[PDB]
Design an enzyme around this catalytic site. Sequence first.
Site, PDB file in Angstrom:
ATOM      1  CG  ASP A 193      -1.257   5.925   1.762  1.00 53.52           C
ATOM      2  OD1 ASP A 193      -2.345   5.736   1.173  1.00 53.52           O
ATOM      3  OD2 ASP A 193      -0.889   5.359   2.862  1.00 53.52           O
TER       4      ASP A 193
ATOM      5  CG  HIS B  11      -1.961   1.075   1.109  1.00 56.79           C
ATOM      6  ND1 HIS B  11      -2.775   1.306   0.019  1.00 56.79           N
ATOM      7  CD2 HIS B  11      -2.202   2.069   1.988  1.00 56.79           C
ATOM      8  CE1 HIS B  11      -3.488   2.389   0.239  1.00 56.79           C
ATOM      9  NE2 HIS B  11      -3.172   2.881   1.424  1.00 56.79           N
TER      10      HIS B  11
ATOM     11  CG  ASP C  84       0.039   1.300   5.337  1.00 54.97           C
ATOM     12  OD1 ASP C  84      -0.774   0.634   4.665  1.00 54.97           O
ATOM     13  OD2 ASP C  84      -0.295   2.278   6.053  1.00 54.97           O
TER      14      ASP C  84
ATOM     15  CG  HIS D  70      -6.989   6.748   0.251  1.00 57.50           C
ATOM     16  ND1 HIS D  70      -6.502   6.031  -0.880  1.00 57.50           N
ATOM     17  CD2 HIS D  70      -6.277   6.325   1.306  1.00 57.50           C
ATOM     18  CE1 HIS D  70      -5.519   5.258  -0.487  1.00 57.50           C
ATOM     19  NE2 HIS D  70      -5.360   5.420   0.849  1.00 57.50           N
TER      20      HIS D  70
ATOM     21  CG  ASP E 262      -5.923   3.074   3.420  1.00 54.81           C
ATOM     22  OD1 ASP E 262      -6.472   2.594   4.435  1.00 54.81           O
ATOM     23  OD2 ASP E 262      -4.993   3.967   3.435  1.00 54.81           O
TER      24      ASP E 262
END
Length: 1000
Positions: free
Chosen positions: A62, A60, A311, A441, A174
Amino acid sequence: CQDVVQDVPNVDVQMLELYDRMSFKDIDGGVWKQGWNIKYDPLKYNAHHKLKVFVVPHSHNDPGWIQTFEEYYQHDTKHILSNALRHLHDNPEMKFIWAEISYFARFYHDLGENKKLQMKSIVKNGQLEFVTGGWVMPDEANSHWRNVLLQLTEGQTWLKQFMNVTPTASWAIDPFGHSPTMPYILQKSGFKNMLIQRTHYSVKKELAQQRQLEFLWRQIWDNKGDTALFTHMMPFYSYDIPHTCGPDPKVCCQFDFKRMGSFGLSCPWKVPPRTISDQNVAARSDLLVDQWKKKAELYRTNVLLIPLGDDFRFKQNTEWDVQRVNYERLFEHINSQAHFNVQAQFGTLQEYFDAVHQAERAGQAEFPTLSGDFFTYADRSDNYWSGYYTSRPYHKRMDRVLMHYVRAAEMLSAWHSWDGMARIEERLEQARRELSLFQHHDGITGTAKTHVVVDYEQRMQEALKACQMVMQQSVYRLLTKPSIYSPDFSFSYFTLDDSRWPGSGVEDSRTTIILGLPSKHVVMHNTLPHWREQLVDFYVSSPFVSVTDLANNPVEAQVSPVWSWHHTIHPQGSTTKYRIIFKARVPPMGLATYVLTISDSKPEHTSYASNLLLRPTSLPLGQYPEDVKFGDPREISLRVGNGPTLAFSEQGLLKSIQLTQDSPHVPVHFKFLKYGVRSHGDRSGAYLFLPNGPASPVELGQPVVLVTKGKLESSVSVGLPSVVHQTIMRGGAPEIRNLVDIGSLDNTEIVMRLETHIDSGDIFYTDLNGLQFIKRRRLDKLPLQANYYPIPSGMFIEDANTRLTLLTGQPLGGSSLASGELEIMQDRRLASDDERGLGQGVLDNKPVLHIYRLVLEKVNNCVRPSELHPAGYLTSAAHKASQSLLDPLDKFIFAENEWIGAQGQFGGDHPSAREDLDVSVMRRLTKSSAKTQRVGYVLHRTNLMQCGTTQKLDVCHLLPNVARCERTTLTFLQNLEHLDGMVAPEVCPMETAAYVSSHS
Ligand SMILES: OC[C@@H]1NCC=C[C@H]1O
Ligand SMILES: [Zn+2]
């Protein structure tokens, strides 16, 4: 075309109904805290019927959260993708899925040729598999559907161009709750499957109990089911390894091999992972397979999805090794031991979905149908994630501004081929990418660290400047005689004028048109494909101005003073500049030129507003011909034109609307209230809304009220604590503007509430992604924060006779907490972290100008859906009010003293389509060297309520020399249908279609 009003669809699971039935009991279910102790029949699986297990490694990433995109790229993601390239190249049975194309494009373009070819080869052989393939994994609550499509298109256009792949499986692990807007767009973009994670713990439990975690997700209006997209909901608390192997995280944590020694990570349940050996493999496989077989009981096939990641995982070479080697040992033992009746291997997401549909077509399972949404999410107890519907409302507003600027820049520049010297394609790519990134997000959600929000803001500021440059060059080319048009592609032929961003109270950056230089050309653009008339305003050096078109026809106008508020909160007038206000008439997808001309004294076709100040001192306005009047606070009533009459309290807040002359004064009260933060137990933060009881009234004091009364425009502004509240009247639905400065009111959330006698009971409507209105039921069995829903563009309440609709220019959180009420949060300031990893509260508030339209209507003569229908629909008036907020006329001021070869109009011959049809996107897809030019159009038809009361739009003929017309996926990447007579048909209500016209 399906009826979307009278027929209610038949689904197995209707989420509003499920919500009515569910108790939402937060029972301790054991090792699976929010579930139960799963049992399976070990005789269920045998050598004929084995459990097929796909372990799907993932990371994951971001695009901004604790760090900026560039920081994460340099310190984490660059190493993840390098190690993936190496480890997948060297280990042909290993697999990896990748979601964020923003990061992948960043990485791929930095590579040498050798590594680019290695990357293409592990993608071609299916080892590295792109999931969704959007620029980001977008927010689903605050995001406009147009921007969800934009970011999807940016990523998949990159993947098609550079990797020759188009994903058909979506991965959304997420986002904080999930929207049916995603399956809507994905299913019209070629997708076959999607996966989601963050749904309410009680919903996971309820669907797990019925093996309804895999479903055919169709739109709430869709009777036939052609919108249906197969959806896998993950059953447990997290996508991390402890909550992906099965129901017991204390066991699953032992199979995250990064959580041993050299990596410096650990298991919270206190049992560490152990290296798999010949000595322990039988015991370890017994525990792991038991977890798998428990997880399989929640699903209908003998094919099991086991995500393996977290993550920013798979960063280190040694992490790849320890996860891969230990799982290979487990697979080698489990597959070799008939007693398990398991086949386990590394796999990808599409591999899982393909195997599930094979099982389905073999007759193993039939899947339930579902409609509705998955808001508002709670991960535990009463921790509802309704905070982020409002968090960082400045950037929420900026999102909707940039959305409009990208549409208008792509549309204005699409009319022509541009020379590469103009850098049109470069500027549009930059603007699309910054807006796409903000759909993340942790972007539009307001859930990132202060410095990351600053990065988002600066990227969006540059995108806005890029859009302005494209738009002004386009308008110059569209309205200049070809005989004169001799462009300097670096020159500013026009400057943009925008009354609503950032707002004159936020950034006093509007240019004053300086006349003496006696006249000045201004141009309006209308991105909507119908004729529009709208009041526009400009700042001018003198109150003695009149308005003409280019053919010298006079245009009625009004002059108002320029007003600003100062902290007592008191207005002060300008002695120097004035607003000229007039009605611009602009063709569909076109341009209209007007002229501002100074004079000696009051011109014939221009009127002067009166100004009344209620509280006194004295307010000179320089040359402004009408003296300011003073009075003690009193109630006041105003009507502009033929439109509603509004009555205001002595605090200057609305109290009643009379629609027509011979109609009742209907009570409609605006009130400002404040929520606080709990002294004891869980604190509100960027994500969580955890109010300490109902909102308490703001103390208004005795506030100052400014009343400007004009023939074309009137307004009531009041200086309240934290809010300059303004009601503007132009002859239809009023416009509300709040200048919101929460200042240093720590642990406060400011709400705007409407109080009416509309007998709504516990029913209200909010939109999803500006695409659709979904019915909500207030539930007293849930806490207040659970009755808060996203208000991305509108909300309404109705009884049998009367509807009130509030349209927004920005996504905010809202509810109807009692019959006759609407409310919407304006801003929130939180001293504490809410323990979801952000490691800060929200203390970076800045002034934001929030904009709304308020539409009171009679609906007794409207055809409304059945009371069983889970959707609502806007009226014509509420829809056009939304369009006025999200896609206003663009205003251009010619920069130079003289415009040789100026033309009056572009697009006078454009078709004026029915009011429910939009050209959401016009985008030229080819650069100037392509011998066949291609232009892409997205067409959206909404559904309006019919209440009693245009030319056909063929986008493929909007440009000349059309050779082919194709219906395509919404991304433009696959041809679906070569069209008859190169005519693009019109689309059904609540349908979105894409078309590419090809030209000689
Ligand atoms: O996107 C990063 C974070 N993941 C865990 C919870 C919330 C998100 O902001
Ligand atoms: Zn995330």
